[PDB]
């Protein structure tokens, strides 16, 4: 099954810093045939630690800046909703509409974006087990959703601190496609270790998964939101190489579900 | 005064509540110390499955819980889970409540301090003690005036909850603190640790505690295993009271 | 039941330093006459991060020390052990053989114990779950041990932090007498907080239990091992007080095991 | 070389170790780029039961080890748990084994690095990577050589064990980093994780594996649910290697 890359800017910070990480996956696109790759931004950052923090340029400004991506590219687009009013004008140019962490539980908020018609892709909570995945993939598929994803970013290990328990990914393959986020699973929570990406990245994909999420950004030390974890666009290539390479080599040893 | 939040999980109908309503707006009249403030939410919008009861919607409970309040002229207190829901439910609530897992959802706390309303936070699972100062700074941003910070455990492994006591004096430095007594004791929860532990919150300090109470829990459509019965909260409250009497000699300043 | 109030200096830095908080807590134990004391210090630390830091005098000198406490005062004692061959020295003088928490798992270490005839306390491992204990009184029992303590001091929350979980009092209350150890409680392993051992051993006994220990020493900012959190010895006679005030309003509620 | 430290968990007898050490040697003969550490402990003294098997002891385990190393030319190694053991047990062990609840017992350390043999470390449940920094220096200081590191799991709520898998590129800064495949799937464990897990130590990167095995896993006396099937080992190395193979162009610098 073709490997999906989730990459993209955390927040859009403007509609040309989009076009220019845009640029480089699509260039990707072209030399990693076989991956499919989906363009990822956040129109808001509607969970900030602070009230001082960047948030984003409104869901109009978001959505526009988004389709012409998609429509100068050619690439597949997700963002995130946070109230579910926000489906609906989302789903006009996302293919996959993602569920925040901690809105996992809001059964209304997974209901939306299900009727949508659009694939949706669930952030698992960090208070979340891996064998409590099973019933939002139900509140999904009852909402009328075909195409679902898990995505694994850690889970709270005592205070500020993400641990990533790899059993996840074979527990929750169970009932939906699983996508490893590289980028939040090494976050400190209002304390991320940058340092840790490649390595857990390499650990996701010889334990098997269908995808990798990793946020991006020309100078990660200028973004306005994870400055600390998004990953150097330049460094992307290199890493979705060692990605195939690594899930090649160990792909006949993945379990069966 | 100490203030004191219960009531049924759910709004399983506005019959159940005047049956809770009226054993605590008795208790109100026997402990003339305590603020007691009803509570009751209109929807369960989290249940882990699809096929569990949520409730009869906002309208009917505002209504319900409007009923509540004219029939025993007690405060209200109710969770909202979307940003628009917080200007209908302020015809009522006294204080608005935030659900632990939307603790930082910038929006819904505003909401909720533009009513002018008092708000109530429960502290996310993930949330460590000193991260909530900056929820009270969004509320105050929002105008909020009366904002309190409810423990109700943290992520402990899966499928378990523990309760940091730590939290508390913590907490204490930027609002007022309130103790989750019911959905603090969650295992792989237990009733019989409710009791025990609403001890160790009062003894260690805090200013209310919070507490669901059913006329008969294993019939209630939510939180079963762990709503006190109705009978059973005098006897709590009493207890509460005369430990707090003697250990609030000891609690730390600020 | 007599409430078991556990106390002395972490190490025994000296005879002096002994004699000094014996004296104390002498005075301590004729004024709260409802209260067992029980003076305790290690001759040993065996299990110190570094191999630099303090570990003590050695084991002879250490009974020797005790057994100058408990002939100049007449108060009980207490002392850890650390390999099995100990167990029959320390009993000597000892009136309750200690089990360090790391080592609540070692059967030749518990049986060691056990056969002496002597009280035995054993810390839980910041590694057991509060109904592992069970299994731990078991083998006390087996060995022949009659009177058995259970310790509380904390669970290992994240990394080189504890949190003290209080359901495990009124679950390991189920098969023996209940310690709460308020100074190690509060320990930052390999990193303590002074702020919070007054509050969290006001908790413990108002959900209950048997008796607190407490680690104190005159001057804890020179001590040799856990100056951060060995309570001042002045302030000693203050929290006891505190203690039984509080145990005495709570009792009423304590529930039947 | 890359290590593989395999065999039965416990002596369960001589004969079950010349069983499992003949399946090793054939295993060494056909991976000369392994070097390969015949395991199995003559006590197991932390079991959590009074009842439980812990072994037929010392003289009889080195005994047993010894007849592996003289018949089929292995390395080995076997834990300790006091003192007094490592003089006697370093006839035989190539590698003496600390306990991970005894990964701080000094006495124990600086024993076994009095040998002049190697010493593994397990990283007690309770460890933080970092703090396992002081772990070598005290071997160090005991005058230990060849000092390893074992990734075991650490406490993650109660009954369950979680890898930090970050811990070995920290760990990687002050020894040589194992991965104890068997132990470290423990579940409120589960054979099911242990493969996938394996795949990810040597994708992120160490320096060996550890994995306990025996011909019939349902019949052991010890860990039974964890113990992988010796049939199986063969495949799971080989497996090993080539994910090694590709993956190690990209371990990260010390
Ligand atoms: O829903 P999630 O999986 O967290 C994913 N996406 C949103 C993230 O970009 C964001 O929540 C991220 O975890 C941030 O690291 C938290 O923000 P702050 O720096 O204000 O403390
Ligand atoms: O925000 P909170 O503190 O959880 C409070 N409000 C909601 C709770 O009453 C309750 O529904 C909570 O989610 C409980 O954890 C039990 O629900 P479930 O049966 O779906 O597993
Ligand atoms: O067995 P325990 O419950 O830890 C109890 N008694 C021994 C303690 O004094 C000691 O282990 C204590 O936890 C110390 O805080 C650890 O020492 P170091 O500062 O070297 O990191
Ligand atoms: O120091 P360690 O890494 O645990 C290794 N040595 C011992 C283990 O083989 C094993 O006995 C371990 O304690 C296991 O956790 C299972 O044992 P029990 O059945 O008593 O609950």
């Known amino acids: 099954?073709?490997?999906?890359?989730?990459?993209?800017?955390?927040?859009?910070?403007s509609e040309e810093l989009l076009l220019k990480?845009?640029?480089?996956?699509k260039r990707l696109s072209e030399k990693f045939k076989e991956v499919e790759f989906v363009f990822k931004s956040s129109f808001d950052?509607?969970?900030?630690?602070?009230?001082?923090?960047?948030?984003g340029h409104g869901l109009?400004?978001?959505?526009?800046?988004?389709?012409?991506?998609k429509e100068e590219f050619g690439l597949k687009i997700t963002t995130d909703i946070h109230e579910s009013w926000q489906a609906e004008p989302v789903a006009e140019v996302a293919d996959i509409i993602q569920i925040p962490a901690f809105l996992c539980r809001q059964t209304?908020?997974?209901?939306?974006?299900?009727?949508?018609?659009?694939?949706?892709?669930?952030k698992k909570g960090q208070f979340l087990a891996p064998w409590d995945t099973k019933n939002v993939v139900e509140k999904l598929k009852f909402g009328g959703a075909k195409e679902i994803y898990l995505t694994e970013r850690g889970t709270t290990f005592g205070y500020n601190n993400l641990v990533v328990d790899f059993r996840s990914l074979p527990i929750m393959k169970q009932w939906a496609k699983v996508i490893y986020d590289a980028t939040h699973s090494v976050q400190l929570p209002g304390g991320g270790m940058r340092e840790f990406i490649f390595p857990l990245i390499r650990?996701?994909?010889?334990?098997?998964?269908?995808?990798?999420?990793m946020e991006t950004h020309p100078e990660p030390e200028k973004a306005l939101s994870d400055a600390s974890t998004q990953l150097p666009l330049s460094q992307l290539e290199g890493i979705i190489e060692a990605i195939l390479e690594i899930r090649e080599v160990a792909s006949k040893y993945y379990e069966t579900i």
Do not use: W
């Open 1 to 13: 099954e073709k490997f999906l890359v989730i990459a993209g800017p955390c927040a859009i910070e």
């Open 21 to 25: 990480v845009g640029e480089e996956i």
């Open 45 to 55: 950052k509607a969970n900030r630690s602070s009230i001082h923090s960047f948030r």
């Open 60 to 69: 109009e400004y978001g959505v526009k800046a988004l389709r012409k991506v």
């Open 108 to 122: 209304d908020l997974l209901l939306a974006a299900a009727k949508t018609g659009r694939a949706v892709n669930v």
């Open 203 to 213: 650990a996701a994909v010889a334990v098997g998964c269908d995808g990798v999420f």
